[PDB]
Amino acid sequence: DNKGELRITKEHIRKIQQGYDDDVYGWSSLVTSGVIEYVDGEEEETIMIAMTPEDLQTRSLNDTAKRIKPEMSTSSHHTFTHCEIHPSMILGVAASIIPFPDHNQSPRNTYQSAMGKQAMGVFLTNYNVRMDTMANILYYPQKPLAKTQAMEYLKFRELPAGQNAIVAIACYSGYNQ
């Protein structure tokens, strides 16, 4: 009767929190253990994915605050066999930077991950010794506020390249046309 339910119980999160097995225990041990498996470009044909682990159970109104998932109205008894980790992991390494990406029009995501990769900033913490043809250090960097859960991994907050200024969206004297 585990059916429908995920296989990574809270046991596993606890262990991964300690960092050791309760008689090293990291990622590859997850995979080889039996709770995450790899799918490639093809096998991803013949499987079934729920978006977030909240859609395993047949989910059950009409308040205007959240977003509209499909309820799965085809099968009165479905058969999932895979469930995403978290779909904010479809973006690229230069696109998780966009904060609240999904409230946008894609041509803007595109200009983003084609401009953020030109930010003046602090690229490696040893500009003193490297002697390179260009480099550019911005004086006073600032980790920004609209962080994701991924700048917890791109070190972008220990190494930002941008600043926070008071933006006032209001035509003023026509110089900003």
Binding site: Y139, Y140, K143
Partner: protein
């Protein structure tokens, strides 16, 4: 890099107020309560300290440039 001199938008000296702030964190405070005790009422100042990341620790960590 090292905490600035003036807050950017307003212009109330913020530099000094850095050390104490870390020290406040050392007791379990909250950034809100901390800032309030450091008496930063507007937010312009409150970002000039709530964001600021201090690099220069790395920039030193290289054994002497000399």
């Amino acid at each position: 890099m090292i905490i600035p001199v003036r807050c950017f938008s307003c212009g109330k000296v913020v530099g000094d107020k850095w050390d104490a702030y870390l020290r406040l964190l050392e007791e379990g405070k909250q950034e809100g309560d901390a800032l309030d005790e450091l008496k930063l009422k507007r937010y312009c100042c409150r970002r000039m300290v709530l964001t600021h990341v201090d690099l220069i620790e790395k920039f030193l960590r290289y054994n002497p440039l000399e």
